[PDB]
C-alpha cells in the first residue's frame, strides 16, 4: 500500500550519513534528507571533502547530492515533509546517576521524539537507526501517545545498523542481513513492509529479516556481545596457552575449522577496543540487572572482566620482565589505535597498557603512523604526569633509541617491516619485544639470534 517517497534522517553520524547516502544512490525516486543540529557536519557533507572517511563514500554522495540526497541544518522542515523519519543520534553512556558508566542516556532520542511529534502531522513512520537499549521504542511510543493530535498516526520501527567502521559502503550495498522490527499489529506490519520495500531496491528478500520491535533492539546488542565474547574466549585460552606450552594461534585455527564455530573473530590480542563492543556489553549487563536477571548479568560481565584481565596481565609481564621496576626507563609503544588502519583510539588497549606503565613511572615513547599527536595526549590525561613521562615519536626508530623494551599494541603491518637489526644496536640490554598482536609471528628465531628476548600473547616464554 503505502510507498515511501521522502526520507528524513536525524543525525549525520557515521551511521545515518552513509546509510542514507546509499539509500539515495540505490533509490533515485526517493528524496532523502539528512539533518543535524551540528552546523559543523552539515557544511562538511556539502563539501568536496566529507567529515568522515569511508572507501567509496565520496562517490556515492556526489552521485546523488543535489538530486535526491540533501544535507541540511533545517531539521523541522525535513520532518514535516518526510514519510519516513530515521532517528540516528548517538546514545552516550551515562556519566552520572543511576547506571553511571554502563547505562545508555536516552536524552537525544527523547528530544528527537518530542521534536518529531511537534513538527509533524498525518501519517509518518518513525524508525530508530541507532544502537538503543531494549524497550526504547516503548519510550518513543509513549511520548507519541501522550502527545497525540487529531489525524496523527505515528508508527515506531526498529532498524539497527550493522556496518563495520571501515567497510561501510560494502556492508550497506551487500549486507549479511537487514533487520527490521515492528509491532505485531496490522498498522505495524504495513509500516514494516513500507521500510522492507525500500531495501528491496538492492537487497534480496531472503536477506531481509522482520521481527518484533524488542527482538530487533536486542539483536544488535547481543550480536556485538557474541562477537566480543569470541575474542575474550580465545584470549582466555591465550593465557592458558602461555602456561601449558600450547599455542593460541594453533588452537584458534583448530577451533575455527569447526564449521559450527567458524574462524572469524578468533585472533587473540592484548584486548578488544572500539566504541561499540564494551559499550554495548556493559549496556546489556545493566539491562539485566535492572530486570532482576543477576545470573545473566554476571554471565556477560565476564566478557568485560576477561578483557580487562588480558590487558592487565600483558602490562604485568612487561613490568615483571623488567625486574618489577620501570621507573625512569625508556619504553617504546608501537601502535595506539584500537585496531590497524584507523586513527580511532576509542577504548584502545594501547591506552590502558600505556597507563599501567605510566603508573610505574616509565618513560614512554609512543609512535603511531595514523593517530594524531594531540589525541594521544588527551587520551592519557584525566596534565602534569603526561608532561613528565610521555614523549610522542615521529618515527618508530626514534622511539626505540635507548629503550629497554619494544611494546607493540596495534597490529599495524608496517611494524613487521621494521629494521630490528638497527633497533637492537641502540637499545639497552637486555632488549625486550612484547608482541601484543602476534604480528611478529614467524620472525621469532630471527629476532632471538639478533639478541632480543621476545614474548607474545599466547606463547610460552
Cite the annotated binding site for NAD(+) by residue number: 11-16, 36, 41, 89-93, 130-132, 165, 276-279, 346
- Asked if the peptide bond before residue 344 counts as cis, ω within 30 degrees of 0, the response is no
Q: Is 403 exposed, middle or buried (0-12, 13-18, 19+ CB in 10 A)?
A: buried
Size of the site for Cl ion (CB under 5 A): 3
Distance CA 193, CA 353 (A): 49
Q: What interhelical angle do 248-256 and 213-242 show, nearest 10?
A: 140
Binding site members for substrate:
161-165, 220-224, 260, 267-273, 338-339, 437
* CA dihedral sign, ordered 419, 422, 424, 426: negative
Q: Could you tell me the CA-to-CA distances from 195 to 65, 77, 144, 210, 215 in Å, in that order?
A: 22, 21, 20, 10, 17
Contact between 374 and a copy of itself by CB under 8 A: the answer reads: no
Contact with a copy of itself (CB under 8 A) among 50, 239, 332, 390 = 239
Stretch touching Cl ion by CB under 5 A, among 276-284, 287-295, 356-364, 413-421: 356-364
Q: Which stretch binds a copy of itself (CB under 8 A): 73-81, 119-127, 226-234, 376-384?
A: 226-234
Among 3, 359, 398, 421, binds a copy of itself (CB under 8 A): 359
Residue 179 partner contact from a copy of itself, Cl ion, none using kind-dependent CB cut-offs of 5 to 8 Å: a copy of itself
Separation CA 363–CA 332 (nearest Å): 8
Q: What are phi and psi of 84, to 5 degrees?
A: -125, 130
SS3 call for 349: helix
CB of 185 to a copy of itself, least distance (A): 13
State the Cα–Cα distance between residues 320 and 287, nearest whole angstrom: 39
Say whether 2 sits in a helix, a strand or coil.
Answer: coil
Residue 161 known to be catalytic: yes
Q: In whole angstroms, how close is the CB of 312 to a copy of itself at the nearest point?
A: 9
Cell numbers placing 286: 545493566
**From the CB of 276, what's the least distance to a copy of itself, in Å?**
13
Q: Which range, of 11-19, 51-59, 230-238, 383-391, touches a copy of itself by CB under 8 A?
A: 230-238
Of 216 and 393, which CB lies nearer to a copy of itself in the complex structure? 216
Residue 338's Cβ-count burial label (10 Å; 0-12, 13-18, 19+) is buried
220, 329, 330, 459: the active-site residue: 220
For a copy of itself, the binding residues in 297-356 under the rule CB under 8 A are: 298-300, 302, 305-306, 309
**Which among 196, 241, 276, 400 is annotated as catalytic?**
276
Residue 227 contact among Cl ion, a copy of itself, none, beta carbon within 5 to 8 Å by kind: a copy of itself
Per-residue binding letters, 242-271, with a copy of itself (x by CB under 8 A): -xxxxx--xx-xxx-xxxxxx-xx------
Cell match 532520542: residue?
A: 109
Binder of residue 76, out of a copy of itself, Cl ion, none (CB less than 5 to 8 A by kind): Cl ion
Residue 232 Cβ vs a copy of itself, minimum distance, rounded to whole Å: 7
Nearer to Cl ion, 8 or 266 (CB): 8
Min dist. Cβ of residue 270 to Cl ion (A)? 22
Using the rule CB under 8 A, is 442 a contact of a copy of itself? no
Closest approach, Cβ 285 to a copy of itself, in A, equals: 11
Helix residue spans in 38-158 (DSSP H): 39-45, 57-64, 75-81, 107-118, 136-146
- CA distances 449 to 366, 404, 443, 453, Å, are 26, 18, 10, 9
Name which position in 93, 361, 443, 450 contacts Cl ion (CB under 5 A).
361
39 assigned to active site: no
Long-range contacts of 201-210 (CB under 8 A, 24+ apart): 201/26, 201/27, 202/26, 202/173, 203/175, 203/178, 207/175, 207/176, 207/177, 207/178, 208/177, 208/178, 208/180, 209/177, 209/178, 209/179, 209/180, 210/180, 210/181, 210/182
Interface with a copy of itself, residue 361, by CB under 8 A: yes
Q: Does 134 bind a copy of itself (CB under 8 A)?
A: yes
The least distance separating a copy of itself from the CB of residue 119, rounded to whole angstroms, comes to 15
Active-site annotation holds for 276:
yes
Contact in structure between 152 and 121 (CB atoms under 8 Å): yes
Subset of residues 161 to 180 that bind a copy of itself, contact rule: CB under 8 A: 162, 176-177, 179
Q: Which residues are catalytic?
A: 161, 220, 276
Amino acid at each position: 500500500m503505502f510507498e515511501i517517497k521522502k526520507i528524513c534522517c536525524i543525525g549525520a553520524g557515521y551511521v545515518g550519513g552513509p546509510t542514507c547516502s546509499v539509500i539515495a544512490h540505490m533509490c533515485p525516486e526517493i528524496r532523502v534528507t539528512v539533518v543535524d543540529v551540528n552546523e559543523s557536519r552539515i557544511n562538511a557533507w556539502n563539501s568536496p571533502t566529507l567529515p568522515i572517511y569511508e572507501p567509496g563514500l565520496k562517490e556515492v554522495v556526489e552521485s546523488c547530492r543535489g538530486k535526491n540526497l540533501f544535507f541540511s541544518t533545517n531539521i523541522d522542515d525535513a520532518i514535516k515533509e518526510a514519510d519516513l523519519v530515521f532517528i540516528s543520534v548517538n546514545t552516550p553512556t551515562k556519566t552520572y546517576g543511576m547506571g553511571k558508566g554502563r547505562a545508555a542516556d536516552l536524552k537525544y532520542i527523547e528530544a528527537c521524539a518530542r521534536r518529531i511529534v511537534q513538527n509533524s502531522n498525518g501519517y509518518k513512520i518513525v524508525t530508530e537507526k541507532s544502537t538503543v537499549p531494549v524497550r526504547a521504542a516503548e519510550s518513543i511510543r509513549r511520548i507519541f501517545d501522550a502527545n497525540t493530535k487529531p489525524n496523527l498516526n505515528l508508527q515506531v520501527l526498529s532498524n539497527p545498523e550493522f556496518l563495520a567502521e571501515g567497510t561501510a559502503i560494502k556492508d550497506l550495498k551487500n549486507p549479511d542481513r537487514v533487520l527490521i522490527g515492528g509491532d505485531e499489529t496490522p498498522e505495524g506490519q504495513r509500516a514494516v513492509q513500507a521500510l522492507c520495500a525500500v531495501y528491496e531496491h538492492w537487497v534480496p528478500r531472503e536477506k531481509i529479516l522482520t521481527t518484533n520491535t524488542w527482538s530487533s533492539e536486542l539483536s544488535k546488542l547481543a550480536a556485538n556481545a557474541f562477537l566480543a565474547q569470541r575474542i575474550s574466549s580465545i584470549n582466555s585460552i591465550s593465557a592458558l596457552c602461555e602456561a601449558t606450552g600450547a599455542d593460541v594461534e594453533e588452537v584458534a585455527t583448530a577451533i575455527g575449522m569447526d564449521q559450527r564455530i567458524g574462524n572469524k573473530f578468533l585472533k587473540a590480542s592484548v584486548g578488544f577496543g572500539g566504541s561499540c563492543f564494551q559499550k554495548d556489553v556493559l549496556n546489556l549487563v545493566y539491562l539485566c540487572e535492572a530486570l532482576n536477571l543477576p545470573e545473566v548479568a554476571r554471565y556477560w560481565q565476564q566478557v568485560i572482566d576477561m578483557n580487562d584481565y588480558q590487558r592487565r596481565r600483558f602490562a604485568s609481564r612487561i613490568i615483571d620482565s623488567l625486574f618489577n621496576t620501570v621507573t625512569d626507563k625508556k619504553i617504546a609503544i608501537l601502535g595506539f589505535a584500537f585496531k590497524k588502519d584507523t586513527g580511532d583510539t576509542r577504548e584502545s588497549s594501547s591506552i590502558y597498557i600505556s597507563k599501567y606503565l605510566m603508573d610505574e613511572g616509565a618513560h614512554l615513547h609512543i609512535y603511531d603512523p595514523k593517530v594524531p599527536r594531540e589525541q594521544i595526549v588527551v587520551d592519557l590525561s584525566h596534565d602534569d604526569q603526561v608532561s613528565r613521562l610521555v614523549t610522542i615519536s615521529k618515527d618508530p626508530y626514534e622511539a626505540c633509541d635507548g629503550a629497554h623494551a619494544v611494546v607493540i599494541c596495534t597490529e599495524w603491518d608496517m611494524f613487521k617491516e621494521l629494521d630490528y637489526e638497527r633497533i637492537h644496536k641502540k637499545m639497552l640490554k637486555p632488549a625486550f619485544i612484547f608482541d601484543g598482536r602476534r604480528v611478529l609471528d614467524g620472525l621469532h628465531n630471527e629476532l632471538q639470534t639478533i639478541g632480543f628476548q621476545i614474548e607474545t600473547i599466547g606463547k610460552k616464554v
